[PDB]
């Protein structure tokens, strides 16, 4: 239905018809209180309308040669490159390029954007004979997907379980098959960690291991569920954006105002799930070999490297514009600083390179992005926005923490007499400039926003152990640690007790001194 | 005055008496408006009372032992140990154990409560000589602060100057004498981070060097000014207590609600200060020399790190208790993590150890704590401190960012039902335990009150290079460095380029293969 | 009888007396030859003449005050005041300068020395009935390792063990009784990293768990065994001593060339093990609770972090020498990074005062240091040796790579004209003195001595996992984190989802803003 607001159907939504398919009567929760309509909400309405940009340039004509690609359908239409299945290296590129043009429209901050899940369409458009039996569903939902720049969320994560409760009870939490009809299936259960699920078209509802399921197929499903469907649910975490418009302003909190993407509790009440948005129906295996044979594991790190590169991109300049206005970037130490922020926005640009232009080819033409610099994507961005976070804070040694409490300070000339005096930028700005660009970096750091956004990029791909597993089984299993063992193994043969087994080398018996010594 | 509120001049205020000593009329803005009272305030009444139980807490039978002294100024009152002047070690322990038991009561939240420039008063009391003239302000103001407990606060960091201005402009921008006249000294100018200045009886504005005051003794100034006088005002910054009460409650932010200490801005705008609150007047040998010659920097860090290591006793455990929750506390990997939390709290206990067992006699029978201990409590505690959160952070991997927005959620049945079967605690407690321990942890790291106090933590001491520049001088000027070298050049003396010159050691003359070889 | 080579029963042995005692047919191994005399073989004679003069300082008159105590055996000698159990704190303290100035004659490079297991003799001597029925042995070991300095190692590391072979093969690789007899027992086995033991009298060998053990009490022991009994051997790790000797100077490798402690295997074949010498015996319990109970675990780490510090010391200065040398010292980075290293020195010298002015009495008069100072120090010191090997490889940017051969380059003419001219000091010292200093510093951190020194640091106490666990493990079994966790459970007391449960704080239901905005 959702699509169905469209007034073409050889385009994506525009961000007017993407804000009207939004007032469907989907029941969220927040604060205590039903939201009537996310699009006026003020919680969700200015994060909806960022979103709506993104739709936008779709379809200004200065954008559409990086944004836009003619859909391989044969519905004659475009869509955002992403959503396109990519059939060389250089078509990555290309889809690199797009997802960067869209970050940039967020200025990096929106993670969870349509575009992350446009390569799960993909990875159902480029392997559908996975899902077996609901191949065709896979098939058809490529294509929706694509043609109609369907924004999906992944709700994944399943809730946390007592472990003193009978595990008869506490079963009741995981996403389960309630009852089995002719018209579909009928689940029950919850996800955590919905991220901006409140925007979105559609939710896949994705399977996650837990040890008490044990057998019991009615666990292992993996389906697709639209956000307006009867029993599906949000709890809504405290919202930055209603906080930010009710305490402050977009000049005290201009990222908190319009990127806050809420994360949510989904509720799965009784829903009804027709057949054709089933993709795994009781299948441990399929459930248990998705995530490396599905795709979409091995696509989406593209998208989310991008962001972050776009971020740290806006970080960099960010800072640096900062210690103008403290006037501590004419220290050497400083500028060091600076530029170690820069070699890691450097970083993740370098692997984003990497990820296409050592892209493989894979199943029905597709082009995977190189594997190993997704897991080192995965490993190093954690480290990187730690360190980045940590640099900011100790070189704005003090110009932040004193920051006139609002713009209602500026405004009122009793108190900006003395601000305009005491709290000039160093560089000649006015102390309203200077203001301005201290409470945009705090925004990014420091505030609630700043603050979970820091604790999202941490533990974005899991905890720091999983991570770095998961990078040593990509070595392990595509061949890299055997290569790299040969090379060991090579030495080892080159010498043994006795001396080299090389001839080109010389041994040691006519220099070594130790029977004379001894 | 202010202390007159007190029914008793034989110990300090009640937290009755000093909230009405506050209601004075002080010259205070926020958000645009002027305070009428901050007791009342909703940007400070809370932090307000969470002081007033510090000095309740003098008069509690079963804290008076670890709290309080008598006087040594013939009153035969008592008041908090810190506050009297350390004759001994053991007095400095005392203290550090009155300190803790205070840090306490806001479980080691609040950095710059009245404890903090007690130092100040026993400075002033230990060494009244250095301000020669001023001498006897110096007895006497010791005698009040000690009697009375009055709250001061200290006010040194100058305002930013815009470079690009003439220098006749930049210097009225640092505190400076406009006219000395009969009743006292008229002053202007400003300082920052003015950390619970709102709260407080009095600020200490200390000298601060700036390359542009050059000469000029009118800048060379130390006084003390009352948070009423005419002139003195106020320019907060926002107020975490008040956003916590307008947006959540005491269950979404349960250290915001109560602890926030407003980083201000105090201006000074043509102040009468009488020349009883004057201790350094058109001096810059004296306010040069005053930061290692006046005793305060040599006093109150001690408080500083006691009050870090209560704040890490309530870090740990609550970290403890979050692992707990999640259930990740049974993984050896996040029991190490939690050991080295364990590590950093022991240090920084272990400093305030060493501060009283080498305590050194200073003058007047005045001790002073260990000064190598201060320095290396500097250096550390900025470490620590990104350490701990960074370890809080990757180890609550998913809990604490899809937390229910609200205590409401909790309230309204609706909704209420679902969080009560999908987010129980691991270890058996139930939704409103888990999510209330979850919100006190993101509370303390991740709210813009989180967020502020790391900031404060890293940049408490000033920039990364000026605190270990401190430790070095401190080594180097104490003869540490010397005893340190002297090792150094023994080693040296016991050989040369034809062997070891010291008469135990064997030549290897008898060994070498050189010759054998080439 | 190795005491008996001392010209008097009243004090320890001299240096000249120890090394006599060493003379006594050892079995010991390195590069595939026996070594006949450890006092003037090419890899031992340096190290031992070192360890020499530790025994040499204990009859100087002018260190008697800091490095002896009158025996508490009532024999009327002295002995070196770490070998006599500590009655109080300021015994502790007394000790605690008395290992530090031991130290400070290797200049912190010798951790195994003579006053390492004299900890295990005061244990004997403090808990003796920790034994039964072997009361009498700790008793009497504790009198003459006291009144005769005997040095003891602790060897307990098991060797690895092939997971591949028949467990019952596997079980002949730890010690185990071969055979009880009427003087005694016989037993065969290995341990690993006996560290200096080629320089000792006795080996404490202790029991380490193996789950391959299982029951089986034979492995289930602790008992001393001399240096020379038939069947106790030595294979050693390569001697840096020997190859600095050879191939090297004094001037080129002053540290290697006299404080190699080699890393030996201990090697038991079919040893004789008398009565007296016998601490546990078939004893599962007693060897499980040693550790806990027996006192050594809780005493030598004092030891270790003085001489830690004293180690600091040294390289503290060396690198401020080096520095100079090089002329890196005037920058503002340099000395900060040396600060730094300033601030962790200052950090062990601080854990071990705390460690004494912590004490607490323990059995039969016996106090024991702060024992969660001892578990800071195992997980700091580690962290704090890495960093500070890195900073100093950071900070001598090319100074270290390039230094001439040997002083043999110095000594021609040929060669030295050109050194003379190219190699100076930028401080103004001639090439002799900074290639000098330069090659000190290399044999502190680069050299294979360095290496060495750098692996074992890291690795003294066990893994950075274990370390952290038996940090939290103090912490929770000494009530530590339960009064930490009282803390945050009064906090969590003082509120609940409908506000505040104290009454001197003020609900927000006044100033609530959600019911207006929603």
Same mark, same amino acid.
């Given at each position: 239905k959702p699509e169905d607001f469209r007034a073409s159907t050889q385009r994506p939504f525009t961000g007017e018809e993407y804000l009207?398919?939004?007032?469907?009567?989907?029941?969220?929760?927040?604060?205590?209180?039903?939201?009537?309509?996310?699009?006026?909400?003020?919680?969700?309405?200015?994060?909806?309308?960022?979103?709506?940009?993104?739709?936008?340039?779709?379809?200004?004509?200065?954008?559409?040669?990086?944004?836009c690609w003619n859909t391989d359908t044969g519905s004659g239409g475009y869509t955002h490159k992403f959503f396109r299945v990519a059939k060389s290296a250089d078509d990555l590129r290309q889809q690199r390029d797009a997802i960067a043009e869209w970050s940039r429209l967020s200025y990096g901050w929106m993670g969870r954007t349509p575009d992350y899940k446009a390569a799960f369409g993909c990875a159902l458009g480029a392997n559908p004979g996975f899902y077996g039996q609901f191949e065709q569903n896979a098939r058809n939902w490529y294509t929706r997907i694509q043609e109609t720049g369907l924004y999906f969320n992944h709700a994944i994560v399943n809730p946390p379980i007592d472990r003193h409760l009978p595990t008869d009870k506490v079963k009741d939490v995981y996403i389960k098959l309630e009852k089995e009809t002719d018209a579909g299936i009928i689940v029950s259960g919850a996800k955590v960690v919905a991220t901006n699920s409140a925007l979105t078209h559609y939710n896949m509802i994705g399977f996650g291991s837990a040890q008490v399921m044990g057998?019991?197929?009615?666990?292992?499903?993996?389906?697709?569920?639209?956000?307006?469907?009867?029993?599906?649910?949000?709890?809504?975490?405290?919202?930055?954006?209603?906080?930010?418009?009710?305490?402050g302003s977009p000049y005290d909190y201009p990222l908190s105002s319009r990127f806050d993407e809420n994360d949510a509790?989904?509720?799965?009440?009784?829903?009804?799930?027709?057949?054709?948005?089933?993709?795994?129906?009781?299948?441990?295996d399929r459930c248990r070999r998705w995530t490396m044979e599905g795709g979409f594991a091995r696509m989406y790190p593209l998208q989310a490297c991008v962001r972050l590169a776009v971020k740290l991109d806006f970080i960099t300049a960010l800072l640096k514009k900062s210690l103008e206005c403290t006037g501590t970037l004419e220290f050497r130490g400083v500028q060091a600083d600076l530029g170690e922020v820069v070699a890691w926005r450097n970083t993740f640009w370098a692997l984003?390179?990497?990820?296409?232009?050592?892209?493989?080819?894979?199943?029905?033409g597709a082009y995977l992005p190189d594997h190993a610099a997704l897991q080192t994507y995965r490993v190093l961005a954690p480290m990187a926005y730690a360190k980045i976070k940590n640099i900011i804070e100790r070189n704005v040694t003090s110009g932040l923490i004193y920051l006139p409490s609002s713009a209602r300070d500026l405004n009122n000339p009793q108190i900006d007499q003395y601000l305009a005096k005491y709290v000039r930028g160093s560089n000649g700005m006015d102390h309203v400039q200077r203001i301005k660009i201290?409470?945009? *970096?705090? +925004?990014?750091?420091? &505030? #609630?926003?700043?603050?979970?956004?820091?604790?999202?990029?941490?533990?974005?791909?899991?905890?720091?152990?999983?991570?770095?597993?998961?990078?040593?089984?990509?070595?392990?299993?595509?061949?890299?640690?055997?290569?790299?063992?040969? *090379?060991? +193994?090579?030495?080892? &043969? #080159?010498y043994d007790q006795d001396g080299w087994t090389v001839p080109h080398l010389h041994n040691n018996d006519d220099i070594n001194m130790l029977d004379k010594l001894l």
């Open positions: 009207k398919s939004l007032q469907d009567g989907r029941e969220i929760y927040i604060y205590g209180e039903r939201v009537k309509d996310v699009t006026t909400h003020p919680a969700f309405r200015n994060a909806a309308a960022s979103v709506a940009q993104l739709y936008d340039a779709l379809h200004k004509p200065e954008m559409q040669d990086s944004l057998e019991n197929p009615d666990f292992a499903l993996m389906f697709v569920a639209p956000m307006d469907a009867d029993g599906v649910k949000l709890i809504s975490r405290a919202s930055y954006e209603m906080v930010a418009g009710a305490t509790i989904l509720v799965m009440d009784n829903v009804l799930i027709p057949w054709e948005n089933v993709l795994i129906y009781r299948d441990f984003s390179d990497s990820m296409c232009s050592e892209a493989t080819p894979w199943v029905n201290l409470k945009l *970096m705090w +925004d990014a750091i420091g &505030s #609630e926003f700043g603050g979970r956004h820091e604790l999202y990029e941490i533990n974005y791909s899991g905890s720091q152990d999983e991570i770095r597993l998961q990078c040593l089984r990509q070595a392990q299993n595509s061949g890299n640690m055997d290569k790299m063992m040969a *090379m060991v +193994d090579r030495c080892l &043969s #080159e």
